[PDB]
Design an enzyme around this catalytic site. Structure first.
Site, PDB file in Angstrom:
ATOM      1  N   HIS A  99     -21.308 -56.758 -18.636  1.00  0.00           N
ATOM      2  CA  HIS A  99     -22.085 -55.542 -18.392  1.00  0.00           C
ATOM      3  C   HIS A  99     -22.229 -54.707 -19.655  1.00  0.00           C
ATOM      4  O   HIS A  99     -21.307 -53.981 -20.033  1.00  0.00           O
ATOM      5  CB  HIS A  99     -21.426 -54.701 -17.284  1.00  0.00           C
ATOM      6  CG  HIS A  99     -22.250 -53.528 -16.842  1.00  0.00           C
ATOM      7  ND1 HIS A  99     -22.581 -53.307 -15.522  1.00  0.00           N
ATOM      8  CD2 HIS A  99     -22.819 -52.522 -17.544  1.00  0.00           C
ATOM      9  CE1 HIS A  99     -23.304 -52.207 -15.426  1.00  0.00           C
ATOM     10  NE2 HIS A  99     -23.458 -51.712 -16.639  1.00  0.00           N
TER      11      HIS A  99
ATOM     12  N   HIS B  11     -25.411 -52.443 -22.279  1.00  0.00           N
ATOM     13  CA  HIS B  11     -26.783 -51.986 -22.463  1.00  0.00           C
ATOM     14  C   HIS B  11     -27.258 -52.236 -23.889  1.00  0.00           C
ATOM     15  O   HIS B  11     -27.184 -51.354 -24.737  1.00  0.00           O
ATOM     16  CB  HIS B  11     -26.903 -50.502 -22.132  1.00  0.00           C
ATOM     17  CG  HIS B  11     -26.743 -50.201 -20.675  1.00  0.00           C
ATOM     18  ND1 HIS B  11     -27.814 -49.944 -19.845  1.00  0.00           N
ATOM     19  CD2 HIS B  11     -25.639 -50.134 -19.896  1.00  0.00           C
ATOM     20  CE1 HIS B  11     -27.377 -49.736 -18.616  1.00  0.00           C
ATOM     21  NE2 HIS B  11     -26.062 -49.855 -18.622  1.00  0.00           N
TER      22      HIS B  11
ATOM     23  N   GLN C 217     -33.690 -47.529 -14.843  1.00  0.00           N
ATOM     24  CA  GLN C 217     -32.888 -46.358 -15.164  1.00  0.00           C
ATOM     25  C   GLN C 217     -33.267 -45.092 -14.404  1.00  0.00           C
ATOM     26  O   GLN C 217     -32.406 -44.363 -13.906  1.00  0.00           O
ATOM     27  CB  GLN C 217     -32.972 -46.061 -16.659  1.00  0.00           C
ATOM     28  CG  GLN C 217     -32.160 -44.826 -17.084  1.00  0.00           C
ATOM     29  CD  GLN C 217     -30.653 -45.004 -16.911  1.00  0.00           C
ATOM     30  OE1 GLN C 217     -29.945 -45.409 -17.843  1.00  0.00           O
ATOM     31  NE2 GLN C 217     -30.152 -44.670 -15.723  1.00  0.00           N
TER      32      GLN C 217
ATOM     33  N   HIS D 138     -26.231 -50.969 -10.523  1.00  0.00           N
ATOM     34  CA  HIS D 138     -25.378 -49.824 -10.819  1.00  0.00           C
ATOM     35  C   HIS D 138     -25.217 -49.104  -9.509  1.00  0.00           C
ATOM     36  O   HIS D 138     -26.139 -48.418  -9.050  1.00  0.00           O
ATOM     37  CB  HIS D 138     -26.019 -48.867 -11.814  1.00  0.00           C
ATOM     38  CG  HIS D 138     -26.054 -49.380 -13.214  1.00  0.00           C
ATOM     39  ND1 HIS D 138     -26.712 -50.539 -13.563  1.00  0.00           N
ATOM     40  CD2 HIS D 138     -25.519 -48.887 -14.358  1.00  0.00           C
ATOM     41  CE1 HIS D 138     -26.577 -50.742 -14.863  1.00  0.00           C
ATOM     42  NE2 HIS D 138     -25.862 -49.751 -15.367  1.00  0.00           N
TER      43      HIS D 138
ATOM     44  N   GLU E  54     -22.514 -44.841  -9.102  1.00  0.00           N
ATOM     45  CA  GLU E  54     -21.867 -44.345 -10.327  1.00  0.00           C
ATOM     46  C   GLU E  54     -21.786 -42.833 -10.335  1.00  0.00           C
ATOM     47  O   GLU E  54     -22.463 -42.176 -11.124  1.00  0.00           O
ATOM     48  CB  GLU E  54     -22.570 -44.825 -11.602  1.00  0.00           C
ATOM     49  CG  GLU E  54     -21.716 -44.584 -12.880  1.00  0.00           C
ATOM     50  CD  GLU E  54     -22.411 -45.010 -14.168  1.00  0.00           C
ATOM     51  OE1 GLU E  54     -21.763 -44.964 -15.241  1.00  0.00           O
ATOM     52  OE2 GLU E  54     -23.605 -45.384 -14.107  1.00  0.00           O
TER      53      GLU E  54
ATOM     54  N   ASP F 123     -19.743 -51.781 -21.131  1.00  0.00           N
ATOM     55  CA  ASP F 123     -20.892 -50.977 -20.710  1.00  0.00           C
ATOM     56  C   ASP F 123     -21.765 -50.491 -21.870  1.00  0.00           C
ATOM     57  O   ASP F 123     -22.949 -50.822 -21.941  1.00  0.00           O
ATOM     58  CB  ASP F 123     -20.433 -49.778 -19.877  1.00  0.00           C
ATOM     59  CG  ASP F 123     -21.458 -49.339 -18.880  1.00  0.00           C
ATOM     60  OD1 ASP F 123     -21.039 -48.788 -17.856  1.00  0.00           O
ATOM     61  OD2 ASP F 123     -22.665 -49.553 -19.114  1.00  0.00           O
TER      62      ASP F 123
HETATM   63  N1  LIG Z   1     -22.961 -45.325 -17.754  1.00  0.00           N
HETATM   64  P1  LIG Z   1     -24.200 -46.357 -17.513  1.00  0.00           P
HETATM   65  O1  LIG Z   1     -23.574 -47.555 -16.981  1.00  0.00           O
HETATM   66  C1  LIG Z   1     -25.229 -46.517 -18.960  1.00  0.00           C
HETATM   67  C2  LIG Z   1     -26.478 -46.282 -18.776  1.00  0.00           C
HETATM   68  N2  LIG Z   1     -27.198 -45.890 -17.565  1.00  0.00           N
HETATM   69  C3  LIG Z   1     -26.537 -45.711 -16.346  1.00  0.00           C
HETATM   70  O2  LIG Z   1     -27.067 -45.394 -15.268  1.00  0.00           O
HETATM   71  N3  LIG Z   1     -25.176 -45.907 -16.304  1.00  0.00           N
HETATM   72 FE   LIG Z   2     -24.213 -49.623 -17.248  1.00  0.00          FE
END
Ligand SMILES: N[P@]1(=O)C=CNC(=O)N1
Ligand SMILES: [Fe+2]
Ligand SMILES: N[P@]1(=O)C=CNC(=O)N1
Ligand SMILES: [Fe+2]
Lengths: 411, 412
Positions: free
Chosen positions: B56, B58, B151, B209, B212, B308
């Site tokens: 995981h 980005h 996102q 995701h 979160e 992450d």
């Molecule tokens: N903290 P993260 O996993 C990184 C980018 N965007 C998200 O929604 N969560």
């Molecule tokens: Fe993430």
């Protein structure tokens, strides 16, 4: 001996450091990067810093994890139970051997200043005797302070007050305590009055395990701070852990900060140790259990980080590297802002030295001891981000450690 | 090539690994330490393990921290605001270069399998275009999976559903999502319905995701889990984060575990990322904000750890080293017991690989690809305690990285 091409913290250019007769003779700004010198310590643009400090560790317990059994619950209290089991077989030689190994680990990671606690709730005071001798024997590696720490309490362990007094007489240079472990609140309080009287009488430094518990009503910190304030001893007093402050009522805590600032005392926080031992009595959500480090710092109060344990009844890991602890602290305490990161080495050098009252025996300034490290990074941010290696450790103007710079091969 | 005097995880013996034609031809226990000939690697009693996995990350956002401003609050939502700003100047080439550099870091630390999320809430889909080509360019170092990550949401963002669909048509391997960030609860639910339909229709993996946030009422996990169960897609579904579980009502969570077990889905936790981003809306005491990792594992549910972010709008640190995250994870999740330590490498090797459905393309077994590492340690415990360096990395039977053992000198 000269150190050339070195960066100094939160500055930009390069400097030569001239070391003579054990002290820092000269510090001079360079026009630029200078020709690689094999006769000198060539920092090649890397940071020079004063040595890392380990202001809180238990050298009498180190390297005993699992003997005779494990802390299966991962709590402070079973840890004390297990330690009592191991303490049954302690001797000075056993203490000296394990302490010297761990001092070796600290040395490998650039630590030259160490404050160890030693359990004095032991009629033989075996570990204290051993570590008083180790202070002299290991002087070529570290400056060791020793805290008389009554692990099983002052007020309810047999002859507790007399053991503390004997320990200080024998030469422990810091007075400890454990008020949250005394059998009752009133004895928690009486223990603090006793130990401050003891410290004041002998002109000793003070470092108490204070409120290492998630009970928001564990408020011995206010008692210690006030004693420090009344007696004018604040600069010489340290409160270790203060985990309970991480759970305090916020109205009370705001009021408390006024006294904390006025007392002038120092704070030590052990993030790896607390993340492990705290939060154990919650289900979900599960508290972090670490004291309010960011808030203490923002209030102008001195706070710093420590490893606490290396492979002991309380903590199964540990390798001597304070930078790992720094990384953990900044994460758990929410100190990863841009500004925090640009000065984050404060929490394992300058701040820690202050807590230890090191004074002009610490820091990179002319006339001070020639004790310093070459770190494999150009600044605080990269130091922590990369967990920068200690390439060179210099003590009294002498090289005591050298590490080759890593180079990966890609065949 | 041959590797001798190699330890294996959770075993006492010394082994010889015979690698040929890109695969693992033989694994044979030795009687004792042996001498190495020419063309023979001596593991020197060190551990041999399959590659580290970063399940995981980005890559589209990596190495953009501070541009154009910093995430001052250290929150998920401000991080999203900053990312949108940075998104305005995103291009395929700047994305390629940053992705490639961070891939280099992952490589330096023995990661050979990576699953990246890519923001597809962007009409240009520029980063997606970039990472699809990076999957090809970087294949000599890693096997990359790409997640279509919306996102700014599926139901909330203009043409959200169209954008997810285009991303999948372009060949994203995994369908992502962000139900807790959708504008209303009902749209969080519908977003999960859509994404499951999309994945199931195009035969893709899923990695969402999921919850979160520290709100105990963020319960999109149950929806995701139930869809996975009903559609028989458990193994191909992963719920990332699930931070809200770290705050759930305990009676609800006990009930929920029955479904989680029945669903077969995987879980990913990001302990350094969440210790940073979670707990931001508490005063004191301050919650950890991490999902119930030790608990999921004890229930027989597959869970693993991940970095992450690396130097991005949500997290200013990062260096590619999964072992630091393992250490962080074991502490925050109260998994420092003797037994946990003896097997803790599960959480950044085997368990991760399972979440990525690597199957027989992963693991030290005869017949499988010759992809492996020699670590500077003898067991799981020492690996994590010492933050053991990757001495050798081998991919397709060829050494792709070599480190020399550190030797500290004491001149005085
Ligand atoms: N903290 P993260 O996993 C990184 C980018 N965007 C998200 O929604 N969560
Ligand atoms: Fe993430
Ligand atoms: N966690 P710790 O600092 C280690 C030993 N003894 C204690 O009371 N506390
Ligand atoms: Fe301690």
């Amino acid at each position: 001996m000269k150190i050339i091409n070195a960066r100094l913290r939160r500055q930009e250019a390069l400097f030569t450091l001239d070391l003579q007769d054990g002290i820092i003779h000269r510090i001079t700004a360079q026009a630029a990067m200078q020709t690689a010198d094999a006769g000198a310590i060539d920092a090649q643009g890397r940071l020079a810093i004063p040595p890392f400090v380990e202001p809180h560790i238990h050298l009498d317990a180190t390297l005993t994890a699992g003997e005779p059994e494990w802390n299966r619950s991962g709590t402070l209290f079973e840890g004390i139970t297990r330690w009592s089991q191991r303490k049954a077989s302690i001797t000075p030689e056993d203490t000296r051997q394990r302490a010297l190994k761990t001092i070796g680990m600290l040395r490998d990671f650039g630590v030259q200043h160490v404050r160890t606690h030693v359990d004095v709730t032991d009629p033989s005071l075996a570990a204290l005797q051993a570590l008083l001798a180790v202070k002299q024997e290991a002087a070529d590696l570290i400056d060791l302070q020793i805290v008389a720490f009554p692990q099983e309490g002052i007020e309810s362990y047999p002859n507790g007050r007399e053991l503390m007094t004997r320990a200080i007489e024998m030469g422990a240079d810091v007075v400890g305590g454990i008020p949250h472990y005394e059998n009752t609140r009133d004895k928690g309080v009486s223990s603090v009055m006793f130990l401050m009287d003891l410290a004041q009488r002998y002109g000793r430094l003070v470092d108490v395990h204070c409120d290492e518990i998630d009970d928001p009503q564990s408020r011995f910190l206010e008692v210690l701070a006030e004693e420090a304030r009344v007696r004018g001893m604040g600069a010489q007093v340290t409160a270790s852990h203060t985990c309970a402050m991480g759970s305090y009522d916020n109205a009370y805590c705001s009021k408390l900060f006024r006294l904390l600032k006025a007392s002038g005392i120092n704070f030590i926080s052990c993030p790896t140790e607390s993340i492990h031992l705290q939060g154990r009595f919650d289900s979900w959500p599960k508290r972090r259990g670490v004291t309010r480090v960011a808030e203490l710092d923002r209030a102008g109060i001195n706070v710093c980080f420590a490893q606490d344990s290396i492979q002991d009844p309380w903590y199964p890991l540990g390798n001597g590297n304070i930078l790992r602890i720094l990384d953990a602290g900044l994460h758990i305490c929410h100190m990863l802002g841009y500004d925090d990161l640009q000065r984050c080495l404060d929490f394992v050098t300058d701040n820690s030295a202050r807590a230890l009252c090191l004074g002009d025996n610490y820091g990179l300034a002319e006339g001070r001891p020639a004790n310093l490290l070459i770190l494999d990074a150009e600044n605080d941010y990269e130091a922590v981000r990369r967990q920068a290696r200690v390439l060179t450790s210099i003590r009294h103007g002498k090289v005591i450690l050298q590490r080759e710079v890593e180079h990966i091969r890609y065949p």
